[PDB]
Amino acid sequence: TRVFKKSSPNGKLTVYLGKRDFVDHLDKVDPVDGVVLVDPDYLKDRKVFVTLTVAFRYGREDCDVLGLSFRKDLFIANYQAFPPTPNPPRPPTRLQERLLRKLGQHAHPFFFTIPQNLPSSVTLQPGPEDTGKALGVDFEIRAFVAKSLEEKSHKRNSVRLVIRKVQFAPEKPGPQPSAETTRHFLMSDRSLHLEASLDKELYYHGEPLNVNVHVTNNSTKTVKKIKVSVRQYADIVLFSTAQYKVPVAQVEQDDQVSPSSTFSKVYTITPFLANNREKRGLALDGKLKHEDTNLASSTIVKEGANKEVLGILVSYRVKVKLVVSRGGDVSVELPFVLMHPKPH
Amino acid sequence: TRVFKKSSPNGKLTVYLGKRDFVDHLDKVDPVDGVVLVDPDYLKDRKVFVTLTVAFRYGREDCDVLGLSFRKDLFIANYQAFPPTPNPPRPPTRLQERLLRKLGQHAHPFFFTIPQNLPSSVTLQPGPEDTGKALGVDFEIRAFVAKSLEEKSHKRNSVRLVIRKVQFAPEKPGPQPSAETTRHFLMSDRSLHLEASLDKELYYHGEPLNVNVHVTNNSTKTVKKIKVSVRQYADIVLFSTAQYKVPVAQVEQDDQVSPSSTFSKVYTITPFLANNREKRGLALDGKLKHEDTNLASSTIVKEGANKEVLGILVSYRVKVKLVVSRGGDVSVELPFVLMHPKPH
Amino acid sequence: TRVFKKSSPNGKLTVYLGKRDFVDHLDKVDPVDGVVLVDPDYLKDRKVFVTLTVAFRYGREDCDVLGLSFRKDLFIANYQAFPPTPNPPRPPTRLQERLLRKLGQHAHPFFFTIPQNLPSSVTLQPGPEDTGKALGVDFEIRAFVAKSLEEKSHKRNSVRLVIRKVQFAPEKPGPQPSAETTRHFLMSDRSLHLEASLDKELYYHGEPLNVNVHVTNNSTKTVKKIKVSVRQYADIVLFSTAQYKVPVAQVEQDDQVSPSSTFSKVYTITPFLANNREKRGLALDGKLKHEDTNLASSTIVKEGANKEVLGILVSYRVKVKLVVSRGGDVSVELPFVLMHPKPH
Amino acid sequence: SFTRSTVDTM
Amino acid sequence: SFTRSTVDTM
Amino acid sequence: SFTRSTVDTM
């Protein structure tokens, strides 16, 4: 029943939004619908428009003394709020009708559709060495009044508000993730067998990862140490292909694997943000203004492979490293997903 | 009067230019006209062409041991100097006719038109930490002789000269610039009224800015200090939107504004280059080779809003900051222009 | 002779290549031909494709913890290995027929053509301050099996191998390279004559450069010192024009040239990589994995001037500097080529 | 300033 | 792994 | 070298 609203600094132009967050069901997205409230006597000759834009923004917005974002406009949409447009698309919405009931004549609804080929709201962790905020893709709604679309923007006229787009976990479990690797010697037939498995393929933040690793060291070398870690992969694509990978959680056990022996164990690794408050380049979930959040939720690609290289893509993997004596170190990897469940 | 000229290092190819600077009247620009002087017996099989180009150049040209400019060619034009071309466009000019009288048969005139959607000649201030010159948009005329347009350039054949394009102040004054801002408390009805005004909207370099500020502090907090400054904004657009803003002049007064009191005063602020000889990122007017100049003149956009994002755009603003006790600091902003008047 | 081969990590998919290096004769290039060996029972529903790609790669590939290459795909080609394609282009090759004889039914040949407008395999020298490998253009052959071209790549399925493309010296000598420069005084008719010449225009690595320099100092100033050096020019063009020039060899002689005297001498300068193991930005010939090589061979452009700006272009020049007293220093430049001869 | 909720009525 | 040469036959 | 002015005549 409650309804958010934002107003112009002059107090004359006000916009109402019923929701702050939107979700996608891998086939459709919740439409962005709202109503702008304004008395036409203030303008009496201008026209009101509301614009949807998504940009690759860097830095902060509080008049920092530094070169600001490389403002790449990934996608921009415009709608004519005033003068009134025809009925589509397609009808007015229920909440817009209720708000028009609440206000009356000066209520003007608008409709928008979000294309399916858009990235998710993510924000990179700013570094203490740097200043202000950091780079990150964000959504933004902008409403303004002017006689022309190309008229100069005014602080008193234009109003800026920030919205978010997030995904939620599907209810269908996937195949069981497992991996194996057998490495022999240079000449002798003796080999080194290792197998890694996980309880599930989809987990939840704060839930420990019970990795099941089995080592069949039917060889002559002795494994000195064992290292288990999870790696975060962040694909950066604006006009070139890039990927910045940073370790997030590492666990080491002082276990010796004797030659011609089989050793299997289950280890616990937990990703958390407390220990990485200073690590630059970390990817985090989209924030409102500056509020803290958890780690960046693993966004899942749609069924269509297409391109979808229009922003930041994130994925997680787990690697286990065996410290074999006199070289011969062998490591195995396993991809997995980790992102929020569906609320009610 | 006098006529400038430049010659090839071999001394055989010489070009004559009647002007070194050109101006735009917001609707038309002075055409670039000149005559190339050369005896055809030297070439006897090649062809002579003269080219106009504008580039986003960085660094210096004296064989510095470093990666040179990111040579982006904003716009390039070519004309066939030899063999002779038809009469257009449209007739020969008066000065070209006089020079043809002076020289005779071996005088070949050329004509050029500068499109209206071009930036102004500006140059960023080089930093002492860096080496050589700095980035900056520049104009350049290039004349060379070759059998083909794509033939390899030769130092002896090609000749390079630098020209400048500058604007001048219109004689029509604009609206009076003024600003106001009223901020209340969180709960109490008491507010803070401040108003800023300037004598004019267009000034001249070296002329003091008599900012008129009035403060109506009918509140309970006490304003500790007052800060008045002018900010320089430089828009950098090559393929992404950027803006590097650096303060240029700051003045502070140790004045206390008592609660429930009205205080108005006029303060003097003067922008000058003497105190900022080391500040990197400062924008300066286009130089010939290395000569010093004043601050970058504020270039005014044409009546058409179009795009004009093909280089560097500069503007100036003034901000006054009030240091309010226990937070609640409020600052006011105001834009203004500052660039050279029209000579005779 | 022998035939190279590479196999998938699973050991089921194997590809055979008869050559590792290819050459261009300024009019045609040796076609890339090979045969893929695989039993269809392993896949039984998928399709096999082999792809040729050239990329501007930076850094290393051994899972380094840093942002990897700016993966710009200069040119990509794809061929349908399985299901079998028609006969072209145009017939099967001789070596492919021999390998099909050797293996039998499960041998599937493929054909490729390299366009003439491609750069040469070069690699920049990594810096000790940096980590891993450095930037460089490389060739790569990729074979994989999938139901669709856009299917997700698999480590077990896809196989990656590296090939090289190099040029060889033409047998036709060019014009004799020579240079001269005469500089007079500001007012007096006395001048300074200097002439530089080389034995040939094309040399071989490790062969000394016998530069012949003659100085006619019929002037009043005294030349303090003489400096002779060779400069390496590396053109970097991806979307902007760039050129990173670094000196490679320098020789200085403490010789004084008296006024009104003529002095001619021949000096020896030798470019070598031993003394520049730490100089960052040096260009080197394409390596296989990490093996050392000589300096970057000077690649010669084809007869057609076209554009060819799709990578790294390299050239060499020689400069001799005269240290003239009380200023007036004059230097001469001369271009030359230096790259490997044709083997047998 | 900031954002705020408000009444819906009916 | 690495590369390797092999037979040719005939 | 550098630039220079010259004669115009007539």
Coordinates of C-alpha atoms in Angstrom, one line a residue, chain A residues 32-288:
Chain A
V32 CA 8.7 0.0 -14.7
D33 CA 5.5 2.0 -14.2
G34 CA 4.9 5.2 -12.3
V35 CA 3.1 8.6 -12.3
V36 CA 4.6 12.1 -12.5
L37 CA 2.7 14.8 -10.5
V38 CA 3.0 18.4 -11.6
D39 CA 0.8 21.4 -12.1
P40 CA 1.1 22.6 -15.7
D41 CA 0.7 26.3 -14.7
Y42 CA 4.4 26.3 -13.5
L43 CA 5.7 25.4 -17.0
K44 CA 2.7 26.6 -19.2
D45 CA 4.8 26.2 -22.4
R46 CA 7.2 23.3 -21.9
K47 CA 6.9 19.5 -22.2
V48 CA 7.6 16.8 -19.6
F49 CA 9.7 13.7 -20.4
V50 CA 11.0 10.8 -18.4
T51 CA 14.1 8.9 -19.5
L52 CA 15.5 5.5 -18.6
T53 CA 19.3 5.0 -18.9
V54 CA 21.9 2.5 -18.0
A55 CA 25.6 3.6 -17.8
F56 CA 29.0 2.3 -16.9
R57 CA 29.8 4.8 -14.1
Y58 CA 33.0 5.4 -12.2
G59 CA 33.7 7.4 -9.1
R60 CA 31.3 9.4 -7.0
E61 CA 28.7 12.2 -7.6
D62 CA 29.4 14.6 -4.7
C63 CA 31.4 17.1 -6.7
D64 CA 34.7 15.3 -6.2
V65 CA 37.8 17.1 -7.6
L66 CA 38.9 14.5 -10.1
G67 CA 38.0 13.2 -13.5
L68 CA 34.6 11.5 -13.1
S69 CA 33.1 8.5 -14.8
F70 CA 33.9 7.4 -18.3
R71 CA 30.2 7.9 -19.1
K72 CA 29.4 5.2 -21.6
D73 CA 25.6 5.0 -22.3
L74 CA 24.9 1.3 -22.7
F75 CA 21.2 1.9 -23.4
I76 CA 18.9 4.9 -23.2
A77 CA 15.1 5.1 -23.5
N78 CA 12.7 8.1 -23.6
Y79 CA 9.0 8.6 -23.1
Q80 CA 6.8 11.7 -23.6
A81 CA 5.1 12.3 -20.2
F82 CA 3.5 15.6 -21.2
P83 CA 1.7 16.4 -23.5
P84 CA -0.3 13.2 -22.9
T85 CA 0.4 10.3 -25.1
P86 CA -2.0 7.6 -26.5
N87 CA -3.1 4.7 -24.3
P88 CA -0.3 2.2 -25.1
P89 CA 1.7 0.3 -23.9
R90 CA -0.7 -1.3 -23.6
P91 CA -3.2 -0.2 -20.9
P92 CA -2.6 1.8 -17.8
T93 CA -1.4 -0.3 -14.8
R94 CA -3.4 -1.0 -11.7
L95 CA -1.1 1.0 -9.3
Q96 CA -1.1 3.9 -11.7
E97 CA -4.9 3.9 -11.7
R98 CA -5.0 3.9 -7.9
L99 CA -2.5 6.8 -7.8
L100 CA -4.6 8.7 -10.4
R101 CA -7.6 8.1 -8.1
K102 CA -5.5 9.4 -5.1
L103 CA -4.3 12.6 -6.9
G104 CA -6.7 13.3 -9.8
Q105 CA -6.2 15.3 -13.0
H106 CA -2.5 16.3 -12.5
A107 CA -1.4 12.6 -12.4
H108 CA 0.3 11.5 -15.6
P109 CA 1.3 7.8 -15.9
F110 CA 4.2 6.4 -17.9
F111 CA 5.2 2.9 -19.0
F112 CA 8.6 1.3 -19.8
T113 CA 9.9 -2.1 -20.9
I114 CA 13.4 -3.3 -20.0
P115 CA 15.1 -5.4 -22.7
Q116 CA 16.2 -8.8 -21.8
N117 CA 19.8 -8.2 -22.9
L118 CA 20.9 -6.1 -20.0
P119 CA 23.4 -6.7 -17.3
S120 CA 22.8 -6.8 -13.5
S121 CA 23.4 -4.0 -11.1
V122 CA 27.0 -4.5 -9.7
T123 CA 29.5 -2.2 -8.0
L124 CA 33.3 -2.7 -7.7
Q125 CA 34.8 -2.3 -4.2
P126 CA 36.6 1.1 -4.0
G127 CA 40.2 1.1 -3.0
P128 CA 41.5 3.0 0.0
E129 CA 44.4 4.3 -2.1
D130 CA 41.9 5.8 -4.5
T131 CA 39.4 8.6 -3.8
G132 CA 35.6 8.5 -3.8
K133 CA 33.6 5.7 -5.1
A134 CA 34.6 3.2 -7.8
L135 CA 33.5 1.9 -11.2
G136 CA 30.2 0.1 -11.6
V137 CA 27.1 -0.4 -13.7
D138 CA 24.0 1.3 -12.3
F139 CA 20.4 2.0 -13.3
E140 CA 18.9 5.5 -13.2
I141 CA 15.6 7.1 -13.8
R142 CA 15.6 10.8 -15.0
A143 CA 12.5 13.0 -15.3
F144 CA 12.7 16.6 -16.6
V145 CA 10.7 19.3 -18.3
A146 CA 11.8 21.2 -21.4
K147 CA 10.5 22.6 -24.7
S148 CA 13.0 20.3 -26.6
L149 CA 14.6 17.0 -25.9
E150 CA 18.0 18.6 -26.5
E151 CA 17.4 21.5 -24.2
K152 CA 20.0 22.3 -21.5
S153 CA 19.5 20.3 -18.3
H154 CA 18.5 22.3 -15.2
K155 CA 19.1 21.3 -11.6
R156 CA 15.8 22.8 -10.5
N157 CA 13.9 21.1 -13.3
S158 CA 15.4 17.6 -13.7
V159 CA 15.1 15.0 -11.0
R160 CA 17.4 12.0 -10.5
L161 CA 16.6 8.7 -8.7
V162 CA 18.3 5.3 -8.6
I163 CA 16.7 1.9 -9.0
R164 CA 18.1 -1.6 -8.9
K165 CA 17.7 -4.8 -10.9
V166 CA 18.4 -8.2 -9.3
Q167 CA 17.9 -11.9 -10.1
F168 CA 16.7 -14.7 -7.9
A169 CA 17.6 -18.4 -7.6
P170 CA 15.6 -20.9 -9.7
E171 CA 13.9 -23.7 -7.8
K172 CA 15.2 -26.5 -10.1
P173 CA 18.5 -28.1 -8.9
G174 CA 21.1 -28.9 -11.5
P175 CA 23.6 -31.7 -12.1
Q176 CA 25.9 -32.7 -9.3
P177 CA 29.3 -31.0 -9.6
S178 CA 32.3 -33.2 -9.4
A179 CA 35.8 -33.4 -10.9
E180 CA 38.7 -35.8 -11.2
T181 CA 42.3 -35.7 -12.4
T182 CA 44.9 -38.5 -12.8
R183 CA 48.5 -37.6 -13.4
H184 CA 51.2 -40.3 -13.9
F185 CA 55.0 -40.0 -13.8
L186 CA 57.4 -39.3 -16.6
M187 CA 58.5 -42.9 -17.1
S188 CA 57.0 -45.1 -14.4
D189 CA 53.5 -46.4 -14.6
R190 CA 52.7 -45.1 -11.1
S191 CA 50.1 -42.3 -11.1
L192 CA 48.4 -39.8 -8.8
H193 CA 44.6 -39.9 -8.5
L194 CA 42.5 -37.1 -7.0
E195 CA 38.8 -36.5 -7.0
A196 CA 36.8 -33.5 -5.8
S197 CA 33.0 -33.3 -5.2
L198 CA 30.5 -30.9 -3.6
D199 CA 27.3 -31.5 -1.8
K200 CA 25.3 -29.4 -4.2
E201 CA 25.7 -27.0 -7.2
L202 CA 23.8 -24.1 -5.7
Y203 CA 24.5 -22.7 -2.2
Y204 CA 23.5 -19.7 -0.1
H205 CA 25.7 -16.9 1.3
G206 CA 27.1 -17.7 4.8
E207 CA 26.6 -21.5 4.3
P208 CA 29.8 -23.5 4.5
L209 CA 31.2 -25.3 1.5
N210 CA 31.8 -28.9 2.4
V211 CA 34.2 -29.9 -0.4
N212 CA 34.7 -33.6 -0.6
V213 CA 38.3 -34.4 -1.8
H214 CA 39.8 -37.9 -2.2
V215 CA 43.5 -38.4 -2.9
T216 CA 44.8 -41.8 -4.2
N217 CA 48.6 -41.2 -4.0
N218 CA 49.7 -44.5 -5.4
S219 CA 53.0 -43.0 -6.4
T220 CA 56.5 -42.5 -5.1
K221 CA 56.5 -38.7 -4.3
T222 CA 55.1 -37.2 -1.1
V223 CA 52.5 -34.4 -1.1
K224 CA 53.9 -31.8 1.2
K225 CA 50.9 -29.4 1.7
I226 CA 47.3 -29.1 0.5
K227 CA 45.6 -25.8 -0.4
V228 CA 41.9 -25.3 -1.0
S229 CA 40.6 -22.0 -2.3
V230 CA 37.6 -20.4 -4.1
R231 CA 38.2 -18.0 -7.0
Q232 CA 36.0 -15.1 -8.1
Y233 CA 35.9 -14.3 -11.8
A234 CA 34.5 -11.0 -13.0
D235 CA 34.2 -10.5 -16.8
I236 CA 34.6 -6.8 -17.9
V237 CA 33.4 -6.2 -21.4
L238 CA 32.8 -2.7 -22.8
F239 CA 34.6 -2.8 -26.1
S240 CA 37.3 -5.4 -25.3
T241 CA 37.3 -8.7 -23.5
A242 CA 38.7 -8.6 -20.0
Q243 CA 38.5 -10.6 -16.8
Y244 CA 39.8 -9.6 -13.3
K245 CA 40.1 -12.6 -11.0
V246 CA 40.9 -12.2 -7.3
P247 CA 41.0 -14.9 -4.6
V248 CA 38.4 -14.4 -1.9
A249 CA 38.8 -17.3 0.6
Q250 CA 41.8 -19.6 1.3
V251 CA 42.3 -22.5 3.6
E252 CA 45.4 -24.5 4.2
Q253 CA 46.0 -27.8 6.1
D254 CA 49.4 -29.1 7.2
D255 CA 48.6 -32.7 6.0
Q256 CA 51.2 -35.0 4.6
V257 CA 50.1 -37.7 2.1
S258 CA 52.5 -40.7 2.2
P259 CA 53.4 -42.5 -1.1
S260 CA 51.3 -45.5 -2.0
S261 CA 48.4 -44.4 0.2
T262 CA 44.8 -43.3 -0.2
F263 CA 43.5 -40.3 1.8
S264 CA 40.1 -38.7 1.6
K265 CA 38.6 -35.9 3.7
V266 CA 36.0 -33.2 3.7
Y267 CA 37.0 -29.6 4.3
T268 CA 35.0 -26.4 5.1
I269 CA 35.5 -23.1 3.3
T270 CA 33.3 -20.1 3.8
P271 CA 33.4 -16.9 1.6
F272 CA 32.8 -13.7 3.6
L273 CA 33.5 -10.0 3.2
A274 CA 34.9 -9.3 6.7
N275 CA 38.5 -10.3 5.9
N276 CA 38.6 -8.5 2.5
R277 CA 37.7 -4.9 3.4
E278 CA 40.9 -3.6 1.7
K279 CA 41.3 -5.9 -1.3
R280 CA 40.8 -3.7 -4.4
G281 CA 38.9 -5.0 -7.4
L282 CA 36.4 -7.0 -5.4
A283 CA 32.9 -7.1 -6.9
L284 CA 29.9 -6.3 -4.7
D285 CA 26.2 -6.2 -5.1
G286 CA 24.6 -3.0 -6.2
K287 CA 24.1 -0.5 -3.4
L288 CA 21.6 2.4 -3.1

